[PDB]
Amino acid sequence: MGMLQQIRGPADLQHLSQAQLRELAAEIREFLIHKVAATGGHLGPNLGVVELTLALHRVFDSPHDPIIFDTGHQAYVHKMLTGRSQDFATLRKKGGLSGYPSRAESEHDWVESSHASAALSYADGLAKAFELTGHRNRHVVAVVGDGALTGGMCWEALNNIAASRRPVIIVVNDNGRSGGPQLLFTDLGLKYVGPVDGHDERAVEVALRSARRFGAPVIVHVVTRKGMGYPPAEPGWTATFSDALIGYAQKRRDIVAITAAMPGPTGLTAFGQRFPDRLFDVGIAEQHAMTSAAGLAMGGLHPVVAIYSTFLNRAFDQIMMDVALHKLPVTMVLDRAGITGSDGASHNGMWDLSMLGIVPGIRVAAPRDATRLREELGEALDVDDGPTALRFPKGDVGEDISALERRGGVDVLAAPADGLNHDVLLVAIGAFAPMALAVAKRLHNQGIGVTVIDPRWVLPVSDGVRELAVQHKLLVTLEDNGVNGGAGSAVSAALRRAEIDVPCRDVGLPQEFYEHASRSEVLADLGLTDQDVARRITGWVAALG
Amino acid sequence: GMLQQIRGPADLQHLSQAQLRELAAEIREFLIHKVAATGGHLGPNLGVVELTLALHRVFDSPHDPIIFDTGHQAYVHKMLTGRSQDFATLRKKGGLSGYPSRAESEHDWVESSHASAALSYADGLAKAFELTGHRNRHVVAVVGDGALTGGMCWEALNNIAASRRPVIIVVNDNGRSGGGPQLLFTDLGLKYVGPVDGHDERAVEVALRSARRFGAPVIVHVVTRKGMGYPPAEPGWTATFSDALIGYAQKRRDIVAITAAMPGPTGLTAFGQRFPDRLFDVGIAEQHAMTSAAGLAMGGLHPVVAIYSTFLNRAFDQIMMDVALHKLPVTMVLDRAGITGSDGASHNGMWDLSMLGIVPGIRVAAPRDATRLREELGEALDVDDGPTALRFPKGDVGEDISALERRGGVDVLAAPADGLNHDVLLVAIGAFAPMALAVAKRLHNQGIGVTVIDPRWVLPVSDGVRELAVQHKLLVTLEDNGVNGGAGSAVSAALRRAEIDVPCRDVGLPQEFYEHASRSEVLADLGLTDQDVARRITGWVAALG
Ligand SMILES: Cc1ncc(C[n+]2csc(CCOP(=O)(O)OP(=O)(O)O)c2C)c(N)n1
Ligand SMILES: Cc1ncc(C[n+]2csc(CCOP(=O)(O)OP(=O)(O)O)c2C)c(N)n1
Ligand SMILES: [Mg+2]
Ligand SMILES: [Mg+2]
Q: Which residues are noted in the entry as Mg(2+)-binding (chain B)?
C-alpha cells in the first residue's frame, strides 16, 4: 500500500498521473478486501465506488464543496482519502472508526444517519444556507445510490432543487444496471450527464467537471459494479420468521409479503421462491410499502410488511392514516428490533414500541423465542379488523422458554418459590425473557419472590397483567426499547387507568442515540444486565414504604 | 332541475353535451349555496366539476375505483353518487363527511385527508385485483398538482411503471394558468396524455377514454382553475405566532421559516413579505421540510418549520435521524394542535406530544395563551443544541392567564385557598388552562385544594412538576392530545424515574379516531368539560382521602 500510505488528504491526489490513480485504486481494493468482512461489511458497495470516490476528491474541494453520501455505508474510500486509512483496524468496534460518516471524526463528514434517500434534502438545505450566509462558490455534491433514488424524499428534494440555480450536483451511483428506479430521470427538467462508466476514473472526472461548470443543478449518472475487482463480493430469528410465514401462506392464498428493497435480509426471498406472485419489493419506499399494503387489504388480502424496526419510523403516518384509520388487516414484521449495536445510533430498533403505541386499535407482539414467534405470527394473521405488528431482534434465537401456565394470554415463566411472597411482577418484553429469568433468580437469592411474565401481546396491555399486578408490591417492565412511551410506560398507564397504583418502574433503553458497539457492550454500558437490574430492583423493594 | 334526477353515475350516460353544460352550472350554484365560504374547500370542488362529470362518464365506479388524493375535492363525486340531498348536514356531527367515507358509499375508498397517498392505494388495489382475478378493474387516482409534489407519488409511480396493471394517474393541475411540481412528468417512462383543458368536459372524456383503452398505466394531465365560476374563490393563535416570529426575525438574520405548501394558513405569508429570501415553501413535502431544515441548521441557521400537528406524522423519521441525531437547532411550530373537530379523524392534532416524546433530547412547549406563545417561541429560538417544538390549537386566543408565581420553569395559575389542603396538582397542558382553572374553582367550592400549573415546557418534564408533585396527594394531567404516550404518561414516567409514586391520572383524548363534529362537541362527548373533569377528580380524591 506504498502510495495509499502517502495520501494525507484529498489534495495529495491532485497531481497524480492517471497511471498513479490506477495503482492507488488497486491498493484501495487490496486494503478494503483485507480490512472489511467479506459478508455483512458493505465490502461490495465500497469496492463499487473506488474510482467514483477518487474522481469526487479530484474535482471537488471538500469540505468547501460538501460531499454528502446518501446512506453512508459506502463512505469507506472517502474515509481512506480523508486521513483515516490507519483507523480501519478498529472499524465498527466500540471507540473505533464508525461504519458511517461522523462529524466528530472529520470536517469532511456531514451526515451520520444511515436512513437512505435523505442526502438531496440535506444538500438543498445546505445550498440555501450558503446563499443566505453569502459563502461564494460552495458546490454541494450528493452521492445517491440507485436504491436510495427509489425513495420519495429524493423526489421532494429534486423538485425543490430544480426551482433554483443554487449548485447542487446529484451524482447517481447506479449499480442496479450494467434495484433502481423504473422511472426515467433523463428528462425531468434537470440537466442530465451520462450514463458514465463509474470504473473509468477519468470519465467520471470529465462528467463531474461539466457538472461543476454548468452553474446550476445537474444529475451525473454513473454506473458501478457492486464488489468490482473481488469475485466473491461480485438458528436465526429471521429464518424462524421465513419458515413460519411460508407455512401459513401454504394454507392461505390471501397472505402477501412486502419488503422495502430487503427481500434477503427480511427472510422473504424464500417466500418469493414458493409464491413469486405474492412477494412485492417496492424499492427503498417504506411509505409506499405500508400504503400499498392498505390498498392490498382494501382488495381483500392480508399483507405481511417486513421492515426493520428503525426504518418503520418512515411509515408512521401511513400506519396511522392509511392502515389503522381504515381498520385494515396488515401485519408488520419488525426484524432488528432492540439494540443492534455495531451500526450505531440510526440502526438500533429502539423506537417501535413507543411509535406503535400511538396507533389507535393496534395489537403488537414481541416474541420471546422461536415457538412464540410462530404462535404470535399465526395470531396476527387471524386478526382481520386492524393492524398487527411483531418485533424481534437481530441474530440467533436461543432455546424455547416454557411457560408454567397461561393466564388471559399472559405466559407465567417463573413464580415465587414456596416460602417466598409475590413481591415483584417482572414483565419481560420479547427478547429480554432470558435476562428477566436471571434477574428473578438473583432476587430469589435475596428472599425476594418474583413472578416473571411474557405478555406476548404487549399492546394493548392485557387483563392478565392487570390481574397479576394487584397480587404484587412492585411492577418492573424490562424492554429492549426506549423508555419514553415504551412498554413500561404503557403498563403503568394501563394500571393507573384501572385505578391500580402499585409502584411501576420502566427498565429499558434511555431515550438517547448510542455510539456503535456490540449489542452486549451497549447493554452492559447501560446497566441492562441481570446483575445491574437485580441490584436496582433490590433497592426498589428495600425502599417500599 | 337536472341534478335532482341524477340517482348515480349511469344517469349521466345518455346526457347531451348541452345537458352536461346545464348540469355543470347547476352543480356550481349548488356548491356555492351549500358550502361554507371559509374552510369548506369550495374552490377545489368548483375546479373539478367537468373533471368529475368526465370521470363518471368514462369509468364504471366502483368496478373502476375512483380514488381522490386528499379527498377535499370529492363533493361533486358525492353529488353524482346519491348524496346531493345530504349537503344540508355537510361537516356537521352525524352529517355528511367533508371527505370520502366507506360507510357512506360503495363509491368511496380512502377517508384519509393526508395528501399524496392515492397512487400508493391504487398500486395495492390493482395488485389485489390481479391476485384475486377480478377482470378489467381500472384504478383511477385523481392527484392534485400539490399532492404530486409529495414523495409518496414518486414511490408509487416507480412501482406502477413496473407493471401493465391499469392504473390511470389523473393529474388535476390548478398550479399553472404555482404550487405544483417543478419537475417534468411528460417523460418518466409512463404514457402521457395532455395537457387537457379541464373545463372542456368533452376533451377530458376523450383523454380519459384514451387512457382507459391503453392497456397499461397512463398519466392524464388536466389543467383546471381553482374556484372556476366563483370569482371570490379564483385566526388569533396563528396571527400571534406570525407577529411573534416576525418580531424575533427582525433582530436575528439567522431565523428562516419553512412551510409544506401552507404559507397563508401557518401565518408565514406575512414573514415572507418582510423577509422574502428567508421563507421556503417546499410543496406538500413535510419530509423534505424537516431534512432541508437540518441542512440549513448545518449551514449555521435556525429554521422555524411551521407544519400542522397531524401532518408532522409524515416527518417523524426526519425529526429523529436528520435533526435530533445531529443535535441541530430546528424549531417546529405545530398549529391545529389538539381537537380541530369538523375535518374528522385525520385532521385532529392529537398525536404530536406522543410522537415528539420519542425524540432524544427534544424540548416541547404548549402555550396556554398569546403571551406564553411569544415567550416560549423566544425560548425555543435560544435553544442552539437540539430540536424544539411549540404546539397550539386552531382558532382564536382568549385573554392572557396570569401566573401567581414561576417555580422551576412552571407557572402556578392557582393555589389552594388559605385553609384548604394540597389535595390535587392539576397539570394543565397548553390550551386546557381555562378548563383546569374552572375545575379548580368547582373543587374549591367542594373544599378540595388544587394547585393548577402550566409547565410551559411539557417535555422534558421539569424539576418544577417533580417538586410540586411530592406536596400533593394526587396528580392529574389534563391534555388536548391522545393519552397513549402523552403528557400525562410522560409526567408519570418522570415521577417514577425520580422514585415519586404519588398517584397520577392521565386525563386527555382516548387513543381513538374521532368522527367529524365541532371541537366543543368532541370534547363534550369525551367528558373533557370542567364539570365532567371536576367530577372524576372528586371520585379520585374520595378514594385516596
Ligand atoms: C430508509 C432505509 N431503508 C432501508 C435501508 C437499507 N439499505 C441500505 S443500502 C440498500 C439497498 C441499496 O441501496 P443503494 O442506494 O443502491 O446502495 P448500494 O447499491 O451502493 O449499496 C438498502 C435497502 C436504509 N439504509 N434506509
Ligand atoms: C400531508 C399533507 N400535508 C398538507 C395537507 C394540506 N393541503 C390540502 S390541499 C393542499 C394544497 C393543494 O393541493 P392539491 O393537491 O393541488 O389540491 P387542490 O389544488 O385541488 O386543492 C394542502 C397543502 C394535506 N392534506 N396533507
Ligand atoms: Mg445500488
Ligand atoms: Mg392544485
A: 145, 174
